[PDB]
RNA sequence: GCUGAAAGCAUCUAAGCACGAAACUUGCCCCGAGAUGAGUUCUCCCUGACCCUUUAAGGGUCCUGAAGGAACGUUGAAGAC
RNA sequence: GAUGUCGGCUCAUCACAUCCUGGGGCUGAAGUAGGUCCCAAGGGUGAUGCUGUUCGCCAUUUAAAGUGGUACGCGAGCUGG
RNA sequence: GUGAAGAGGGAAACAACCCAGACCGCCAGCUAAGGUCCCAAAGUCAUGGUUAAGUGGGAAACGAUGUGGGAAGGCCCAGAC
C-alpha cells in the first residue's frame, strides 16, 4: 500500500473507490499499484 | 436503477410473504427471510416482485436495486441453492468432512477444524477439494472466504486453499 | 414598591414523569433544565429554587442524530497523571445510561450551590419503572 | 468456589522421598460454620458468611450473640463472607472443613502483612541511595527530587515517598497444596504466605487457573 | 473480507453481515458509601411521670441510665503520637 | 530593591515523529534474514575505558540500548569537576 | 483613530479592536455593536435553498465517479454506453 497525498490511476485495470471516506486505488492487474490517501 | 426496474419472477412452488418490510421466501431448499431497509417498497404482482423507492427518501433507487438483487438471489437460492468449490494444492494438504465439521491439514503443527453454519453442507469429492452447498448466497460465500483464509494461495506455487475457478498469477524469485 | 421574590419555604413544587424514548438528547435536556430551574413559572426568582421534580424513564432509549452514537466522546480526568479517560456515547449507554442524560442536564444548569440543589430534583431511570408512585407524578410530554 | 478461614501456625519443611525439601506454610483450618446465607432476593447477591474458632462468651456483645443465635452456631472469633458460584448452595449452620481442598492443588492465600511502620523511601519503594562520601552533605537516604520546575509547579498524585508500609491485605496466588490433613485440621501449602504467626488467613481455590 | 446497488459491469459500503493488535473496556490485586446520590443486609437496646409558656412548637423538673462506648490497667509479630 | 549558570547523582513525568516486543500492505518478498510504508505509547529500553564534559570514539553486552518536551525537568534535594 | 489621561456594552477572559464619551438619583422607556435552545436577557420565528463533516469550531501545493446548480457539446431507437 502506497499511502500518499495524491493517489492516481496508473493503468487501465486500476480503479478509484471511496471506502469509509478515504479515497483508495485498487488495481486488479498487480498489487504494486494499490494506493491510499493519507 | 436498471436493476431495480427489472422485476424478479417467482417460479412455481416458491412462496413469498411480505410483512410490511420483512420478506420471507418458502422453497424446496428451505427458508430465507430478510428485512428490507425503509427506503424501498416491494409489490407482489402476478407471479413477480416489483421494487421501487419510497417517497421522501434520498438514494431510494440504490436501495431498490440492492433489494432487487438480494431478492433475486434469494429466490434463486430456495431452488437448487448455490454451491462453491474450493481446491487445496500443496504437498500433504488434505480436507475431510465429518458431520458438519471440516478437518483440514494445511501443513500446520496443529489440527484445524472449521464449524459450518446452520444452512451450509460440505462434502469432499476427493482428498483435496471441498464443495459447499447452501441456500443463502451470503453465508456460503462467507464460509468459502474464511475457509480460504486459513492458508491463502501464496504467490510462488499457489500453495493453499483456492477457489476452484480463481487465477493465482504466481511469480518467480530472483535469478542467482 | 419592591419586586416580588419567591420564598423557599412556601414555594410549590410538582412532580412530573417524562418518557425519554426516541427523544433527542439536547432537545430534551434543555426543557428538563428550564423546568428544574423554574423558568416556566411567573414567580421564578434567580436565587430561589422554584422548579419541579422530574422523573425521566427509559434513559437508555434516548436518541442522538448524526454519527454521535459512536463519535460523541465523554472525557474525564481522575486526578492522577494517567488521568485522562474517555467513553463514547454507546459505551456510556451500555455502562450507565442514566449518566448521559444526567451529564447533559448538569451541563445546562447553573453552577454553584443552587444549581446543585436544582440537579438534586431530577430522578433518571434506565428502565420503564420508577418507585415514586407515592408522589403521584403526572405525565409531562416534552 | 468458596474458601476457608485458617490460622498461620508457622513454617516448616516437608522432605520428599526423592530428596527434595519443600518449604511449607502450615495453616490450621478448623470447621467453618455457615452463619448466614445471602441470595438475590434479599441481599442482591449470593454469598455465605462463616465464622471459625471460638471466643470467650464474656465479651461477645449482645448484637453478635443474637446474630449467632439465629444460625444456632457457637460464637467464633470473627466473620467472613465468600461469594458463591452458580452451582453450590449451603445451609445455615452447616459446617465446612478442610477436605474441601482435598483435590484443589492450587490455592490463593490472603492475609495481613507484617507491619513495618513508618518506613522511608529506600525500604518502601526500593529507592537508590545517594553517595555515602564525595562531599555528600546530609543527604544519604533522602528521596532526592520530587518534581519538575515551575511548569507543573506541583507534585503529582501518587508520588512514591515515605509513609506507612505493611499491615495491609495481601494475596499470594497459585500456591501449591502440599497436603491436606483432615483429622489434624491442617493445610500444608508450598511457600510463604502473608502475615505473622498466629494471624488469620483466607484460603481460596486458585482463580488464576 | 462476504453479499451488494448507486453506475444492467465492476465495487469491502451506500443498506446488511464477518474477522482483525501488548493500545481501549473487562478479566487479576488493593483502597473504596464524606458515592452529602452519605447504599444494603443481619443482630441488639430503650415503651415513666409532671409543670410551664412566647405554643403546633418548645422549655424545664423529678425518676430512670439500656444496648453499647469511652476511660483506666496488663500489653502486642500494631505503632512517631 | 537578584528568576543560581554547564555536567553528574536522586527522583521522575508527558508526547509519538516507534528502538524492542504486538498487528498489517508492498517488495527487485523461495526459506532464513531484510527494505519501505501504515496501525500501535501497554511494558521495557546496558554496566565499563578516556575526558569536567553533554556529545563522541572505543571495549564488551542486549529483544532493544528510541527521539523529544518538562526554566537545555530537578542546587529551600545532593555534588561542585 | 484610540489608549496614555475614558469608565459603560460586545469580542469567553482581552489598555490600545467594534459600539459609545459616565454631573447626581429612579425597582421607567427606546436603541447601538452584538445577539434570541440551556448556563444567560431576548425567535426552539417565517419562507426558499445548501451541507453530513460535528464542516460550522485552525492550516497550503496538490488529489478524488462527494453532492447542489448553470451555460454549451458529441455518441445514439438506422440501436448508443
From Swiss-Prot, chain B:
A single GO cellular-component term on record: cytosolic large ribosomal subunit
Short name of one Pfam family: Ribosomal_L6
Keywords: Acetylation, Antibiotic resistance, Ribonucleoprotein, Ribosomal protein, RNA-binding, rRNA-binding
Tagged with keyword Kinase: no
Statement: the UniProt record of this protein carries the keyword Transcription: no
NCBIfam families xref list: L6_bact
Subunit structure comment from the entry: Part of the 50S ribosomal subunit.
Role according to the record: This protein binds directly to at least 2 domains of the 23S ribosomal RNA, thus is important in its secondary structure. It is located near the subunit interface in the base of the L7/L12 stalk, and near the tRNA binding site of the peptidyltransferase center.
HAMAP family documented for this protein: Ribosomal_uL6_B (MF_01365_B)
Protein name according to UniProt: Large ribosomal subunit protein uL6
Species, as recorded: Escherichia coli (strain K12)
From Swiss-Prot, chain C:
Keyword NAD set for record: no
Keyword Ribonucleoprotein: yes
This protein's UniProt keywords: Ribonucleoprotein, Ribosomal protein
Single GO biological process annotation from the record: negative regulation of translation
CDD domains registered for this protein in UniProt: Ribosomal_L13
GO-annotated molecular function: large ribosomal subunit rRNA binding; mRNA 5'-UTR binding; mRNA binding; structural constituent of ribosome; zinc ion binding
Entries under InterPro entries matching the protein: Ribosomal_uL13, Ribosomal_uL13_bac-type, Ribosomal_uL13_CS, Ribosomal_uL13_sf
Origin superkingdom: Bacteria
Cellular component annotations (GO), alphabetically ordered: cytoplasm; cytosol; cytosolic large ribosomal subunit; ribosome
Entries under Gene3D superfamilies matching the protein: Ribosomal protein L13 (3.90.1180.10)
Functional description taken from the UniProt entry: This protein is one of the early assembly proteins of the 50S ribosomal subunit, although it is not seen to bind rRNA by itself. It is important during the early stages of 50S assembly.
Family the UniProt entry places it in: Belongs to the universal ribosomal protein uL13 family.
Complex and partners: Part of the 50S ribosomal subunit.
Name the record gives this protein: Large ribosomal subunit protein uL13
Upper lineage: Bacteria, Pseudomonadati, Pseudomonadota, Gammaproteobacteria, Enterobacterales
Gene transcribed to yield this protein: rplM
UniProtKB/Swiss-Prot annotation, chain D:
Chain positions found as N6-succinyllysine: 38
GO cellular component: cytoplasm; cytosol; cytosolic large ribosomal subunit
Domain of life assignment: Bacteria
InterPro entries, sorted: Ribosomal_uL3 (IPR000597), Ribosomal_uL3_bac/org-type (IPR019927), Ribosomal_uL3_CS (IPR019926), Transl_B-barrel_sf (IPR009000)
GO BP term, pick one: cytoplasmic translation
UniProt GO MF annotations: rRNA binding; structural constituent of ribosome
N5-methylglutamine carried by residues: 150
UniProt entry keywords in alphabetical sequence: Methylation, Ribonucleoprotein, Ribosomal protein, RNA-binding, rRNA-binding
Modification after translation, per record: Methylated by PrmB.
Subunit structure: Part of the 50S ribosomal subunit. Forms a cluster with proteins L14 and L19. In pull-down experiments interacts with CedA.
UniProt name for this protein: Large ribosomal subunit protein uL3
Native species: Escherichia coli (strain K12)
Amino acid at each position: 500500500m502506497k499511502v500518499r497525498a495524491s493517489v492516481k490511476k496508473l493503468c487501465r485495470n486500476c480503479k478509484i473507490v471511496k471506502r469509509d471516506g478515504v479515497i483508495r486505488v485498487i488495481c486488479s492487474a498487480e498489487p504494486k499499484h494499490k494506493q491510499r490517501q493519507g | 436503477s436498471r436493476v431495480a426496474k427489472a422485476p424478479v419472477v417467482v417460479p412455481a412452488g416458491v412462496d413469498v410473504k411480505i410483512n410490511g418490510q420483512v420478506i420471507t421466501i418458502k422453497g424446496k431448499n428451505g427458508e430465507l427471510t430478510r428485512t428490507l431497509n425503509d427506503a424501498v417498497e416491494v409489490k407482489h404482482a402476478d407471479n413477480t416482485l416489483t421494487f421501487g423507492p419510497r417517497d421522501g427518501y434520498a438514494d431510494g433507487w440504490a436501495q431498490a436495486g440492492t433489494a432487487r438483487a438480494l431478492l433475486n438471489s434469494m429466490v434463486i437460492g430456495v431452488t437448487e441453492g448455490f454451491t462453491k468449490k474450493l481446491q487445496l494444492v500443496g504437498v500433504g494438504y488434505r480436507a475431510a468432512v465429518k458431520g458438519n465439521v471440516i478437518n483440514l491439514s494445511l501443513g500446520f503443527s496443529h489440527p484445524v477444524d472449521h464449524q459450518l453454519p446452520a444452512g451450509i453442507t460440505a462434502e469432499c469429492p476427493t482428498q483435496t477439494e471441498i464443495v459447499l452447498k447452501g441456500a443463502d448466497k451470503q453465508v456460503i460465500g462467507q464460509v468459502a472466504a474464511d475457509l480460504r483464509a486459513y492458508r491463502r494461495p501464496e504467490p510462488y506455487k499457489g500453495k493453499g486453499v483456492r477457489y476452484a475457478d480463481e487465477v493465482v498469477r504466481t511469480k518467480e524469485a530472483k535469478k542467482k | 414598591m419592591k419586586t416580588f421574590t419567591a420564598k423557599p419555604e412556601t414555594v410549590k413544587r410538582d412532580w412530573y414523569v417524562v418518557d425519554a424514548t426516541g427523544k433527542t438528547l439536547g432537545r430534551l435536556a434543555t426543557e428538563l433544565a428550564r423546568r428544574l430551574r423554574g423558568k416556566h413559572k411567573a414567580e421564578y426568582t434567580p436565587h430561589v429554587d422554584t422548579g419541579d421534580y422530574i422523573i425521566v424513564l427509559n434513559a437508555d432509549k434516548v436518541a442522538v442524530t448524526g454519527n454521535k452514537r459512536t463519535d460523541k466522546v465523554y472525557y474525564h480526568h481522575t486526578g492522577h497523571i494517567g488521568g485522562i479517560k474517555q467513553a463514547t456515547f454507546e459505551e456510556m449507554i451500555a455502562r450507565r445510561p442514566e449518566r448521559v442524560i444526567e451529564i447533559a442536564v448538569k451541563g445546562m444548569l447553573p453552577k454553584g450551590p443552587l444549581g446543585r440543589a436544582m440537579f438534586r430534583k431530577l430522578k433518571v431511570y434506565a428502565g420503564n419503572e420508577h418507585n415514586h408512585a407515592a408522589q403521584q407524578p403526572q405525565v409531562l410530554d416534552i | 468456589m468458596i474458601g476457608l478461614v485458617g490460622k498461620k501456625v508457622g513454617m516448616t519443611r516437608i522432605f520428599t522421598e526423592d530428596g527434595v525439601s519443600i518449604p511449607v506454610t502450615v495453616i490450621e483450618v478448623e470447621a467453618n460454620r455457615v452463619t448466614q446465607v445471602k441470595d438475590l432476593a434479599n441481599d442482591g447477591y449470593r454469598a455465605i458468611q462463616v465464622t471459625t474458632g471460638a471466643k470467650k462468651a464474656n465479651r461477645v456483645t449482645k448484637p453478635e450473640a443474637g446474630h449467632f443465635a439465629k444460625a444456632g452456631v457457637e460464637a467464633g472469633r470473627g466473620l467472613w463472607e465468600f461469594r458463591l458460584a452458580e452451582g453450590e448452595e449451603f445451609t445455615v449452620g452447616q459446617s465446612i472443613s478442610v477436605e474441601l481442598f482435598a483435590d484443589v492443588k492450587k490455592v490463593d492465600v490472603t492475609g495481613t502483612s507484617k507491619g513495618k511502620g513508618f518506613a522511608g523511601t529506600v525500604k518502601r519503594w526500593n529507592f537508590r541511595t545517594q553517595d555515602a562520601t564525595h562531599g555528600n552533605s546530609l543527604s544519604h537516604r533522602v528521596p532526592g527530587s520530587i518534581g519538575q520546575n515551575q511548569t507543573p509547579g506541583k507534585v503529582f498524585k501518587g508520588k512514591k515517598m515515605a509513609g506507612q508500609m505493611g499491615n495491609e491485605r495481601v494475596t499470594v496466588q497459585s500456591l501449591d497444596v502440599v497436603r491436606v490433613d483432615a483429622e489434624r485440621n491442617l493445610l500444608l501449602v508450598k511457600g510463604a504466605v502473608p502475615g505473622a504467626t498466629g494471624s488469620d488467613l483466607i484460603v481460596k481455590p486458585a482463580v488464576k487457573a
